[PDB]
Design a protein around this ligand. Structure first.
Ligand SMILES: C[C@@H]1CC(=O)NN=C1c1ccc(NC2=C(Cc3cccc(I)c3)C(=O)CCC2)cc1
Ligand SMILES: C[C@@H]1CC(=O)NN=C1c1ccc(NC2=C(Cc3cccc(I)c3)C(=O)CCC2)cc1
Ligand SMILES: CCCCCCCCC(=O)N(CCO)C[C@@H](O)[C@@H](O)[C@@H](O)[C@@H](O)CO
Ligand SMILES: CCCCCCCCC(=O)N(CCO)C[C@@H](O)[C@@H](O)[C@@H](O)[C@@H](O)CO
Ligand SMILES: CCCCCCCCC(=O)N(CCO)C[C@@H](O)[C@@H](O)[C@@H](O)[C@@H](O)CO
Ligand SMILES: CCCCCCCCC(=O)N(CCO)C[C@@H](O)[C@@H](O)[C@@H](O)[C@@H](O)CO
Ligand SMILES: [Mg+2]
Ligand SMILES: [Mg+2]
Ligand SMILES: [Mg+2]
Ligand SMILES: [Mg+2]
Ligand SMILES: [Mg+2]
Lengths: 363, 363
């Protein structure tokens, strides 16, 4: 409302500048307009990174699409607009904040690079992925986060598969959910001219962007979790490996894929209060799949029977086997944003500590 | 009351026992009932192998389903019912006839194996894949040959992706056609109970069968050709390896996938008369696609311009870069059914001869 448009932006930016962004408060603060949280956060971020400028993105069609995408998220405990916004905030944060030791290459026809206005590298001893990953590719990453769980039913792929859901048959049982999120969101994008916010990309650019978004969204199928980790590890952490070549297209993508994977399951690397909040969501969603499995005569899957819960086993397990090694690898590659110390170690990494702390709760 | 049945059977079997099975003569002989050529061939091969007996397959539902499958193939010049019958004939043949040097591991438990009634290994110096690959797996391979190009539109994946066809968007530009052939054919199968010829397989066997059929059909996407060839040459044709491990599920599957890939593009490895009949079909199909491309103001694809043909370059290239290396690769593995001349020392393989000869036509 004139001068309130700026106060709203500057404040949100202020709150999001935190890894432990108090996202639920924002939800509470939006009140009856909390259903527009994903589109609102998108606008703010594409503006923080200068993406609207770089690709001459028209505001109207940009908001039309993301407003329509939002309403595509179901009202379920975990895989909703809020989780999508959460994942978006994570990748935006992980690709723009200072990282100790990271080597730079190029900041700002030619290949454009973004740069967050809400943060900067303290000195030449830091670096950010945004100086090594072109704008288009990071834009693809942000967009993929927004669409990555679009129209999620609150059920797993094995559930869909085991019950011969039409969606599973349609996708031959492969990454059923992930294929549907990507196909539906792109279907949505191409269904109306008023959504065409990428109209200024040339045909080659648009085609590559579509490919990237799809590649990030499919990377979120946990079934391929171990193949992805192996690859990434082989590229930067394993001995012999030359490391990540930032000038190599496939290396960038892989990094980005790993980045959205970490963001997608970020809960345990957040402050306890946030962690316990996302924990409650996934278990409530599981119980719902369990009630349906039982009603269908099927055996209740492990961790989904409310009358026989194993909440600590779930978090202990899932952290030890999936989240942990993943953050471990990303961190061992020197990509986690953090700060120099000069405790006993020279670098303090906030998520690494949250992860450890939250792990004691359940171990 | 039913004598004119066995005459047919013994006839067709006699004719199919030949690599250069005169499939076009059979289309003629069937006259008006030729539209049911695939279902009829399926039944004949399932008797020949004993799959009907092994899996207690009820004739009624079996014929119902494969008659429905057949009518799903469009009336186009190459990717039709006949082509599917051709591929079907080729996987059965590659899998049942004598292979020089192939150890007769399963020379006769709980796991069933099929045996073609129309042939046998003259002796110990011969073998056959039907003895190293379980009945359930070969059955999946045959059923996939049956369904592999179901509801093919006579257009390429590239064309689909470019015109942004709904199916292209629905599958995220990944093996569009192949995913659709498999998804449509399983949807059909499940749409009605009178199609359930597999009702005597347990949910475990059926689930695995489904997986194998999908794996085989998706393996026919030429986009993944060099990957399969490479992944194959590793496990079967290179360094410090004694080759395949018939005991290994994955190795078995890779063998099956290369077998259906060969059968899928078998034309140039058949006798000159068969080779040219298939060549004619593929060129007319490319021309129909090229007309639509021009009509849409799109650039006409290579080899698809009927006003500026390159028929010889097409065949010479495709044999040199695709068919050829796939066979040489399959041969070095030693899986080709052939014959020693004069046994041991050397082996005469009919398909390699045809291939070399047909190449001379265009080079
Ligand atoms: C990251 C979130 C939030 C949090 O703080 N804690 N826990 C979380 C969380 C916990 C479990 C899962 N698991 C998911 C599973 C895999 C899985 C299911 C049960 C046990 C384990 I072992 C792994 C699937 O295949 C489909 C939906 C995602 C996903 C997220
Ligand atoms: C095996 C058949 C029958 C025969 O006897 N000769 N030729 C055959 C034949 C020739 C070419 C193709 N090509 C197909 C192409 C790839 C391709 C297209 C143009 C040049 C080359 I280089 C390769 C696609 O991506 C989609 C449909 C299948 C398919 C079959
Ligand atoms: C950190 C805490 C997370 C654990 C949450 C465990 C929740 C639980 O065990 N139940 C009981 C299951 O018996 C609750 C939910 O499953 C729903 O019952 C509830 O959200 C709804 O009733 C509100 O109207
Ligand atoms: C919010 C809900 C809190 C639930 C906590 C469940 C804890 C649990 O189930 N275990 C079981 C483990 O089987 C852990 C504890 O019993 C101790 O291990 C822990 O308090 C200690 O290690 C801290 O140093
Ligand atoms: C053996 C060599 C195969 C070469 C075939 C070349 C076919 C060809 O050049 N044309 C004209 C290309 O201008 C024919 C087809 O494209 C259709 O015209 C035809 O199948 C249809 O008329 C039958 O009713
Ligand atoms: C029925 C098909 C008839 C058409 C044949 C077309 C052959 C052709 O266009 N070329 C192009 C060649 O550019 C091949 C032949 O000219 C050579 O294969 C031959 O001259 C050589 O093999 C002798 O050693
Ligand atoms: Mg998901
Ligand atoms: Mg998610
Ligand atoms: Mg109930
Ligand atoms: Mg095909
Ligand atoms: Mg085919």
């Amino acid at each position: 409302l004139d001068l309130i448009l700026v106060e709203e932006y500057d404040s949100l930016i202020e709150k999001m500048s935190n890894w432990n962004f108090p996202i639920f408060e924002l939800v509470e603060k939006m009140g009856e307009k909390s259903g527009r949280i994903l589109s609102q956060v998108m606008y703010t971020l594409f503006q923080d990174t200068g993406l609207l400028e770089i690709f001459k993105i028209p505001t109207q069609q940009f908001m039309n699409y993301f407003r329509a995408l939002e309403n595509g998220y179901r009202d379920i405990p975990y895989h909703n607009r809020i989780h999508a916004t959460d994942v978006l905030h994570a990748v935006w944060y992980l690709t723009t904040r200072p990282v100790p030791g990271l080597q730079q290459i190029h900041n700002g026809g030619r290949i454009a690079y973004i740069s967050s206005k809400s943060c900067s590298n303290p000195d030449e001893s830091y670096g950010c992925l945004s100086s090594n990953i072109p704008a288009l590719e990071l834009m693809a990453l942000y967009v993929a986060a927004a669409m990555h769980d679009y129209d999620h039913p609150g059920r797993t792929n094995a559930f869909l598969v085991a019950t011969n859901a039409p969606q599973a048959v349609l996708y031959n049982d492969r990454s059923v959910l992930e294929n549907h999120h990507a196909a539906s969101a792109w279907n949505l994008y191409l269904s109306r001219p008023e959504y065409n916010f990428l109209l200024h990309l040339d045909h080659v650019e648009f085609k590559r962007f579509r490919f990237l978004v799809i590649e990030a969204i499919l990377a979120t199928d946990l079934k391929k979790h171990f193949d992805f980790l192996a690859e990434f590890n082989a590229k930067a952490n394993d001995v012999n490996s030359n490391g990540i070549e930032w000038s190599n297209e496939n290396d960038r993508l892989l990094v980005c894929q790993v980045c959205i994977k970490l963001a997608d399951i970020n809960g345990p690397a957040k402050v306890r209060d946030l962690h316990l909040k996302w924990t409650e969501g996934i278990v409530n969603e599981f119980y719902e799949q369990g009630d349906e499995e039982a009603n269908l005569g099927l055996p209740i899957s492990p961790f989904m029977d409310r009358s026989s819960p194993q909440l600590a086993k779930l978090q202990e397990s899932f952290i030890t086997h999936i989240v942990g090694p993943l953050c471990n690898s990303y961190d061992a590659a020197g990509l986690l944003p953090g700060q120099w110390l000069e405790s006993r170690r020279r670098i303090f990494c906030q998520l690494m500590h949250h992860l450890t702390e939250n792990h004691k709760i359940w171990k």
